[PDB]
Subunit: 94 residues, 2 copies
């Protein structure tokens, strides 16, 4: 339950968004030949705040999410190399 | 307009047109106000938003960088009037 400290700090809504991103990516990757990196696009002020939070970023790295390429990208990415199983395990871990 | 044309020649025409439309939509919204983010949803618009020359243009048009540690996105400030926004868009 890696998410627990962030839940207690009030980040349940951004954590739910992160969870859905991981699960949706897993579903897409169950098809052979289909594996695209997914940008984590914060679409609300609350999710923006989470993406700029150091503790939330630490969780992202632990789950295997990669930071943006500086000078090229704005968004963190769910790397293409992660399998549906790896992704679902990350989501299940919070 | 000169800075924009230079970015057009460096291959940023598509993000410039996106930026143009964002400014115009903000202008329309403010006639009918709050600061609104510039949200790049494509790799190409992301690349522009992270480019130093493109950022120099944003600053000249009156767009402000994100608040460090709080925001991800650049903002179109509330202080820009619809008239200012349309003039900015018209320069590209």
């Amino acid at each position: 339950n890696l998410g627990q400290s962030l839940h207690q700090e009030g980040f349940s809504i951004p954590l739910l968004w992160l969870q859905n991103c991981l699960i949706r990516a897993a579903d897409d990757r169950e098809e052979d030949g289909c594996s695209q990196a997914v940008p984590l696009v914060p679409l609300t002020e609350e999710n923006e705040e989470a993406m700029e939070n150091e503790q939330f970023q630490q969780l992202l790295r632990k789950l295997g999410v990669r930071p943006p390429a500086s000078g090229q990208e704005t968004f963190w990415r769910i790397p293409a190399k992660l399998s549906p199983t790896q992704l679902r395990r990350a989501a299940a871990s919070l």
